[PDB]
Amino acid sequence: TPQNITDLCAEYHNTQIYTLNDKIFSYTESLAGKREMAIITFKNGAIFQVEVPGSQHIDSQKKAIERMKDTLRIAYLTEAKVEKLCVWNNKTPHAIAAISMANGVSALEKEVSALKEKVSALE
Amino acid sequence: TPQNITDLCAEYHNTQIYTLNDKIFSYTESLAGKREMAIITFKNGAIFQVEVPGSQHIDSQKKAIERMKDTLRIAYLTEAKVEKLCVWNNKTPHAIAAISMANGVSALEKEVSALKEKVSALE
Amino acid sequence: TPQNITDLCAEYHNTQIYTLNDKIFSYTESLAGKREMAIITFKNGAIFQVEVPGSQHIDSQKKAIERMKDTLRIAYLTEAKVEKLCVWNNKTPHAIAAISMANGVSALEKEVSALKEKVSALE
Amino acid sequence: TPQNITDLCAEYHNTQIYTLNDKIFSYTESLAGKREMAIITFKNGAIFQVEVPGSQHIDSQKKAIERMKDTLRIAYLTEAKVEKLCVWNNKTPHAIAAISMANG
Amino acid sequence: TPQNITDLCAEYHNTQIYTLNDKIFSYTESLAGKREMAIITFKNGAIFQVEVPGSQHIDSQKKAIERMKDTLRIAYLTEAKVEKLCVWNNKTPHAIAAISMAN
Amino acid sequence: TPQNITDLCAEYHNTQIYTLNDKIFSYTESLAGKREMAIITFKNGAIFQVEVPGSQHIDSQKKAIERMKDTLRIAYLTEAKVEKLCVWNNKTPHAIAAISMAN
Amino acid sequence: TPQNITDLCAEYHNTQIYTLNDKIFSYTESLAGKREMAIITFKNGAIFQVEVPSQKKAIERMKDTLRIAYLTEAKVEKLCVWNNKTPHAIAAISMAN
Amino acid sequence: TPQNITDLCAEYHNTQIYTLNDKIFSYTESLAGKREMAIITFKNGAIFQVEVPGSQHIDSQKKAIERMKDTLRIAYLTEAKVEKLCVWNNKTPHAIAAISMAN
Amino acid sequence: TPQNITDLCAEYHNTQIYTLNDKIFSYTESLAGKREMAIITFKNGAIFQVEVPGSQHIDSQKKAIERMKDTLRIAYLTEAKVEKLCVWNNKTPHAIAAISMANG
Amino acid sequence: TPQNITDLCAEYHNTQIYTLNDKIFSYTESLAGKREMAIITFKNGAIFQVEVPGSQHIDSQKKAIERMKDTLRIAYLTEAKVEKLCVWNNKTPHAIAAISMAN
Amino acid sequence: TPQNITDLCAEYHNTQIYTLNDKIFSYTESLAGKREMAIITFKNGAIFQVEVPGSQHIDSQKKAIERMKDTLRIAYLTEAKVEKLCVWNNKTPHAIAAISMAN
Amino acid sequence: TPQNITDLCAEYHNTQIYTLNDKIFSYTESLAGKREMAIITFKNGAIFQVEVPGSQHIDSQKKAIERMKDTLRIAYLTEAKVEKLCVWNNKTPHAIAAISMANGVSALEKEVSALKEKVSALE
Amino acid sequence: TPQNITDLCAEYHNTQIYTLNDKIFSYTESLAGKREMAIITFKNGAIFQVEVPGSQHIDSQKKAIERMKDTLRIAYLTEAKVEKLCVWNNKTPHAIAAISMANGVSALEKEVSALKEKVSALE
Ligand SMILES: [Cl-]
Q1: How far apart are CA F30 and CA F34, in angstroms?
Q2: How far is G72 from chain F (nearest CA, A)?
Q3: How near does any CA of chain B get to the CA of C109, in Å?
Q4: For I86, which of E72, I97, L10, L47 could close a Cys bridge (C-beta 3.0–4.6 Å)?
């Protein structure tokens, strides 16, 4: 069994890791017939789907597909940073296989936390 | 597969995009027999339903109809801005097919606007 | 005539903008028969090709395909920041149609550099 | 034969000199069909193209169009000051006919 | 289409990946008749050629052979780290099919 | 065969050597029809062209004219000292036949 | 196929290796009719040409190599040259750092 | 199906509504090869085109492009107020997709 | 053959007469792909379309759809009173099948 | 060739002249399948159609039917006095074959 | 190419100019089979036809014949002064080849 | 893409702009074989044709030639001011490539209308 | 036949356009043997000759050379703005082939600027 998303991703053909360290920019969901799907975007222009169940999914994946859509919705609404996505790159948009969330404090976010410690000390 | 709500909407007859860029004003839900439905309103007076599950829905849409009602409820309670709705305009109220939510608000841009108000007051 | 890479990208089917504001992480080039191509990667995991010249290219594109590979090589070797790529998302890896380079100090990054000059002068 | 970019510019209809005395802010290039072009910008908001080769170019200009795009790319990457551009003002963006680089 | 040099290399017979993670030690180029070739070496003693264009090359490779020699020359002069070479191990020196450069 | 630019220059009519021992002050290039040319200037006011390729050039000179414009551009951008220019003084501006660069 | 410039040079009759281990002192190029040539010199006093013209491309490449070597001050290790020409004519160049 | 120009505009990428509530200031039309186009201007300086028919148009649009030019000409000649234009903002001038007239 | 718009309307399923006795308040027309349509409104808030030509139209209707859009545009520009519209009420907006204009 | 509408009308079976010397009271047009027609009325109660085009009408008459509908619409909108109609009396309503307008 | 209607008319056999300097008194149009024609009259009693399209017309004339009928109808309805008609005098009524309108 | 008739005109050989700011004086149209053309004149003596369709026209121009004749007829009948014509000067009469209409004769006419409002107020 | 000085200039070898948009600063004329010539200067330091009639002139040019000297003299004496000179740059001073003079700033536009200065002072 793999111990992280990168090792998990390497067990499948036609997959790659995207490292975003960013919150979701947009969340789209459809109940329309044959398009019961979710789409997320990031500021950098990356677009990802959770595929419509049917075609190419085994029974054990049905619950995990529904869980992924719940995860993306609550991540979007809480502005949770997505660390990595494992995706299938043979689909358009690229299709989510796995997600990691970690709070990796952004580049100028350490200089904004330090001008909030120096700004709440002077005035 | 479509990459966004506008392309998704164009795959169906009797649909249109409403651009709201606003949070939901009201959320209504019913468990009454033959009216197991949700209704949302916006400040501008727009009214939308999630239809009662019925003969016009295929089996794959049952879970997506339940998910849409979960999405609208948590969006209402968190005051999330709705960007667009794709709706069937041959129903009254217009019936939701898809929803997009977009997060404009720049994360550390609210802490940079607040250390520009605290920095142009002390020194 | 388009005025920028975003307008240029919108003139084609199956394209999207990626905003990277990052230097190229890796540059790969092949002279092997039927794989006369280049591949670039970014730290974020994004992979892009310049396609093998083929039946989907018109004669006008031949010189521009060779120019794009020259541009990517010199950009890699000088660590030039890539601002945007316009790519075809119906290819795997996504295929480069256009590139913009600007050394763009970010929006709130100019107000963070100015509250680091005003903050290292008071205390 | 003209001795400088200003005299060269005056030999063509629908041209004007822009004096920038600034390095290129952005360099854009496309291999997309019918948009095999370059676009440069300056900090001041000025936008210029090297046109797609077309029916308004004579055969002798094909190599010079390719050379101009090489020049703009290496100028961008070395932060060379552009002194002047001679451009066609009947195109949007204005289309580069000539470039001078001086002592920046 | 492959996504990296290792997958590209595996599509051909008689090829292998060398991982160098090192800059080029020497660049040699010849204009002598029937030896219009380039040779690079690494500190570890590894020697690689860009083959003389010949009957084993298809027309689409002609420009890519010239590009490879340009790439090796500018890589040598800028001391760029070569990550991997895909080479034909059927030739002596081994003949370059592909190069990857990574920081 | 001549061994330096001065001996090379003396093989042609209407040529002279200018000794600059200075980097190029300005580089101008045109893609305008019938003016596909380059112009360089020096601080001392000297102006030189690479002529538009034309009926006064033989086929072997076409590539050398393109090479000269590449050389002048990279010389300008690297601030390389130009030692001497061999030019045709029959043309206005004087037209470059050869360039020497020494540190 | 030879593996270095010295073995390559030994495959031809009129050739010799010069070992310079020095950067190029001067670069000269001409576009004049029948003298489309390059001349390089070393501090040592050594003078070499790329002669006036698939060897067509290699002649053009050699002149590109000598120009960028001159401008980057790259050390030239060895030249293989034809000694039946004056100046001696470049057949091959090796650069080692 | 949309019920108004604003909803219609939202069904396309790279579009926006301009509200003019003004008559057309100028009408320009061309029969020249590869420029078979119309341009309208408003007093406020806004410029809009009906694009040359091209590869970005499907067959069903050919008649509608001709109708739009008829509509703009009769609107200009009758001084009809244009309420809104839906336009593609990735073109210069911005390219008309739809027009509404009220009042 | 029917002698008036009301009798014509009664020959089709899913149609109804609207009596407006009013000029058109707004005229909207689109050349966008798959939305090659017209929309008219009246002061009372009523909205009507000329449908995109499609699989529900027979060949003879192509010309009549183009004629209807010409009629609505010239009616709007001349402020002609529309007497009645025959429309399909199974479309949103309701889709025009016929128009009458009466001078008195 | 006849020189007026009355002589033209007399060349056909099942036709007659109506003299109206009045503008059109109502203009009706339909795009409904198999009813692609126009109906005009006069204050005196006279009703006339432009017949549905079809495949059993000669090609020259299909174009003239389209012209007649354009003529009736612009006549209605300008309140032009209709002098005479030539109509086929074997159709109900009587079907327009020709129209004359005098001031 | 002629510069006015009088020079145009003189290029054909069997033509003459009528100078009317008057608006059209009557406009007649027919969709009856083999009489798809227009007839105009002037107050002075002059009668002119646009001929039925037929074997004496070349393909380039088809659109121009339809344009002439559009021109005569809009001229009649706007009371535009007709300056001159170029007509074929070997037809009865005389057949319109060209029209000029001036003021 | 050009932005106005003057830029459009400069894209062609053998063309020039005439600025008329005047209504059409005469409209002539012919259906005679090989002279299926229109001729307009202005009071100043300028004569212009819409050329007979021929071998010098590409297929895309056919509809635009018919449109130009419609435009000239309705312009004549409404007395619309023609601002500019782009014409080919290698034809006799000069042949129309483009027309602009604007209701101007403004420029110093707006400062003459304002010194007639200031002059009928003082004396 | 060319339509302007720029097209005329492009028909000759060793010519260039100078744009002066200025009146002539000096006029010099000589009747001395073998120097029967004119020289004009501009404030910017530009010097131009009308060449001595000679073996490089065809018979047709004799009258035009005399006319050019008449034109330059009357232009000098009336302070007429010279727009452009087409000159041979293989002669010292550069030798005049053609001259353009352009007007612009309108006749009654100087009396409209003066009844706007007299009208915004009284009433
Ligand atoms: Cl005859």
Answers
A1: 10
A2: 9
A3: 10
A4: I97
Question: H6 lies in which domain range?
Answer: 1-103
Give the three-state DSSP class for F54: coil
In D1-104, beta strands by DSSP E: 15-22, 26-30, 38-41, 47-50, 82-88, 94-102
Name the β-bridge partners of B98.
A30, B86
Q: In whole angstroms, give the CA distance from residue H69 to residue H65.
A: 7
**Which residues of chain F come before a gap where C and the next N are over 2.5 Å apart?**
none
Decide: residue G21, CB within 10 A, 0-12 exposed, 13-18 middle, 19+ buried.
exposed
F16 bridge partner residues: F87
Between strands K47-50 and K94-102, the pairing is: parallel
Tell me whether strands I47-50 and J26-30 are parallel, antiparallel or unpaired.
unpaired
| Dihedral sign, Cα of residue H57, residue H59, residue H64, residue H70 | positive
SS3 track for chain K: CCCCHHHHHHCCCCEEEEEEEECCCEEEEECCCCCCCEEEECCCCCEEEECCCCCCCCCCHHHHHHHHHHHHHHHHHHCCCEEEEEEECCCCCEEEEEEEEEC
Establish, for the pair of chains L and M, how many residue pairs have beta carbons separated by less than 8 Å.
20
Alpha-carbon distances of E3 from C39, E82, K60, rounded to whole Å: 7, 18, 59
Angle at B6 between CA H37 and CA B55, to 5 degrees: 130
How many Å lie between the alpha carbon of J6 and the closest alpha carbon of chain I? 25
CA proximity to G24, closest of G87, G82, G67: G67
Of L25, L34, L39, the CB nearest to K3: L39
Distant-in-sequence, close-in-space partners of G13: CB < 8 Å, separation ≥ 6: none
- Nearest Cα to Cα of residue H11 among A97, M115, I35: I35
Q: Subunits touching K (CB < 8 Å, at least 3 pairs)? A: J, L
State the resolution, in angstroms.
2.5
Angstrom distance (rounded) from CA F30 to CA A79: 53
Residues of J whose CB is below 8 A from I8: 28, 30, 32, 35
3-state secondary structure chain G: CCCCHHHHHCCCCCEEEEEEEECCCEEEEECCCCCCCEEEECCCCCEEEECCCCHHHHHHHHHHHHHHHHHHCCCEEEEEEECCCCCEEEEEEEEEC
Among the listed residues C46, C78, C56, C52, the one whose alpha carbon sits nearest the alpha carbon of residue C65:
C52
> Environment class of residue H59 by beta-carbon count within 10 Å: exposed (0-12), middle (13-18) or buried (19+)?
exposed
Q: Where are the alpha helices (DSSP H) in C1-123?
A: 5-9, 61-78, 109-112, 119-122
Beta pairing, strands J47-50 & G26-30: unpaired
Chains C and G touch (3+ CB pairs under 8 A): no
Rounded to whole angstroms, how far apart are CA atoms M86 and M2? 13
Total domains in chain G come to: 1
Q: Is H90–C1 a contact, with Cβ atoms under 8 angstroms apart? A: no
- Peptide bond before residue G2 is cis, with ω within 30 degrees of 0: no
Q: Do J99 and K32 touch (CB under 8 A)?
A: no
> H61-78 and L61-78 helices cross at what angle (nearest 10)?
20
Indicate the burial class of M67 (C-beta count within 10 angstroms; 0-12, 13-18, 19 or more): exposed
DSSP E68-82: HHHHHHHHHHHTPPE
Decide: helix, strand or coil at residue J99: strand
Residue E80's contacts (CB-CB under 8 Å, 6 or more residues apart) are C77, E23, E74, E101
Please state, in angstroms and rounded to a whole number, the distance separating the CA atoms of residues K39 and G52: 84
Q: Can you tell me whether residue L18 is helix, strand or coil?
A: strand
Q: What is the residue whose two structure tokens read 């009454």?
A: B32
DSSP annotation of I93 reads S
Write the CB contacts of J56 (distance below 8 Å, at least 6 apart in sequence): none
- Closest by Cα among C11, F33, M7 to D88: F33
Deposited experimental method = X-ray
Query: What's the CA gap between B29 and B37, in Å, rounded?
Result: 6
CATH label of the domain that carries residue C14:
2.40.50.110
CA dist A25 and C34 (Å) reads 39
